[PDB]
């Protein structure tokens, strides 16, 4: 009788709300049965979330479930069945790779699988997806402008647009598309992208600390696009993307009606004491070894005395062990009326037990900021 062991389900408690994430219409999402398929035959005596051996077995077991869905997709008798299977495969391949850093080529291969599933699927979607490369100096940035259900240029005024950034270990068409659906559902356009070291670029180029440079290039594209009202822009970042949201607020905040920070902070906890696989996660994203990472963290740290140039909404957990709440509250106090803090008392990083609730509130808050700017 196939089931997950209690020792394993307990061990993975922190990641279960991440793996299930948001109930979505378009974004790939696992079923409970996919988690059972992955973990039912997971080797015993292997329960250390900080161990390389754990995440190797995680990667190969989730890869098997992804493979099974590709086989279903290849044998599917309808386009609707084909796309459902491709979406399930993409979700499985994402959870295979997201905390696996030991084989750079294998991790990149798994993200290529996901992007292939996404690009293949767009054809069958009822949403208009405008996909292109934005050239930022010599960097060719993958970019997706997505319009709401049943959108037509001719029967619409220029739309508000939300730009959403990846965190360190998110995939654009998984977590970020999931968040983006809350804005698509409110008849807003969304802009999702792969900056350096983000999405398909993770393990190819180092993550850019100054991601606001790349966001500036997106803003210029949206200004030029007749379908988008560039006076009704929002920037949302999740996890390390929330750190980028705070940078955007300081540097190019005047371009935005409002900015959403989902559990980003102005500085990261001490690198050497980071729990789980976070050291290897940060190392992989920055393409740097252990010995260089604290120096990067010191460089990352924001000057919070530099003001944010727009309205900011931060969602943060009291028990966040990456972006410590004391630093976020200091920023909230100093940034004053322009910064609103929703703090969940017993929530860890990204408050994922509350994500349905807070994304309802966040999406209505963004709508309200556009309305305040005369939409």
């Amino acid at each position: 009788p196939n089931r997950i062991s209690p020792e394993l389900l307990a061990t993975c408690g922190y990641f279960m709300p991440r793996i299930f994430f948001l109930n979505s219409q378009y974004a790939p999402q696992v079923h409970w049965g996919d988690v059972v398929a992955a973990l039912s035959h997971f080797p015993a005596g292997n329960l250390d979330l900080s161990s390389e051996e754990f995440w190797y077995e995680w990667m190969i077991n989730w890869s098997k479930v992804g493979d099974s869905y590709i086989n279903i997709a290849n044998s599917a008798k309808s386009e609707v069945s084909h796309v459902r299977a491709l979406r399930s495969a993409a979700a499985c391949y994402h959870w295979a790779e997201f905390m696996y850093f030991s084989d750079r080529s294998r991790k990149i291969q798994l993200r290529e699988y996901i992007r292939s599933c996404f690009l293949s699927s767009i054809k069958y979607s009822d949403l208009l997806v405008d996909h292109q490369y934005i050239v930022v100096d010599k960097f060719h940035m993958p970019f997706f402008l997505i319009f709401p259900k049943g959108y037509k240029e001719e029967e619409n005024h220029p739309l508000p647009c939300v730009i959403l950034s990846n965190g360190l270990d998110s995939m654009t068409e998984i977590e970020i598309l999931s968040l983006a659906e809350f804005f698509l559902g409110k008849n807003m356009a969304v802009a999702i992208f792969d900056g350096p070291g983000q999405g398909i670029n993770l393990g190819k180029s180092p993550i850019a600390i100054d991601m606001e440079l790349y966001v500036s290039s997106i803003v210029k594209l949206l200004e030029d696009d007749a379908r988008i009202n560039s006076n009704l822009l929002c920037f949302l970042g999740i996890s390390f993307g929330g750190y980028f949201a705070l940078r955007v607020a300081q540097r190019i905040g005047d371009k935005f009606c409002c900015i959403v920070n989902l559990s980003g902070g102005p500085e990261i906890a001490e690198f050497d004491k980071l729990p789980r696989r976070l050291k290897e996660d940060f190392q992989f994203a920055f393409m740097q070894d252990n010995s260089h990472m604290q120096s990067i963290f010191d460089e990352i740290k924001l000057d919070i005395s530099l003001p944010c140039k727009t309205k900011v909404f931060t969602v943060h957990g009291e028990l966040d062990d990456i972006f410590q709440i004391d630093k976020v509250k200091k920023l909230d106090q100093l940034w004053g009326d322009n910064h609103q803090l929703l703090c969940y008392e017993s929530e860890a990083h990204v408050c994922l037990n509350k994500i349905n609730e807070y994304m309802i509130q966040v999406s209505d808050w963004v709508s309200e900021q556009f309305w305040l700017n005369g939409y």
Copy 2:
């Protein structure tokens, strides 16, 4: 740090794939965080799935999460936020009630909450819902005819239609609407209904063993409806609804191109030895005490020598402890070429670890049967 205890998550292993069910667009569905909200403060030393005390605490704790979503719904700043919250509340209230039988009025109240959320929400849906009462003698049967996304009479030929039946403890707009989306996605109409002792009628009227009488009245409505091709009908039943699917196959199978039996069987295991809360579940549905139930089970038992009058697809688990696999395999052998059996080796009742996979296969099989009948 709010989380579910390992002892509880292990105990509930059987029900976790039921509670998460299918990733749906319209059907209410819980998030992982909803399960945490319900079970994080669940009283310790209370881990008996057969105990009345367990399901009381389950009901009050899930009721709290439902209440929280109604509060979000009442304060929602948009219609899209309002409907998302109503859907989340409905899912929570369903898991509060589905295995709770000790207060008839409270259980009926919770199903009224769900139906109120559903009827309130239809207004905001992009699907055409034709809701009415079908009069069967003196019984007024709640009935929902739902058309595919962007359906218009004038640009469509008469559609195929799938009639879906509840199991003993399902709710029409939760599990059955979830299944129905697989057929709506293939541009088929779906017919979902509350027969005696089903959906909103559970605890009001006893469940009708001869549910095919009520299905006959649906078939007549679909024959009369210009929008439906009554020569392209399917009947699907899940759990005890699958038992009804086998009855429909024997009595009025000629009305159907094909019938789907999701883990129904021709007879039930011995009543006195039923595990978990199944005795109280069957007692509540039939509105009968313990002493009368085995007699009803003896009456329920099908004459498998009576042939099925159409093509039948059964999905069954080898380890099903309600509809034993030996009885299903005997039926498969006797019904011969007209019956196909998909048997999952290590699956319990309804094979819920496989439901995404098998509903892809089932939906394509139904499409194929309509095609064979010249669609």
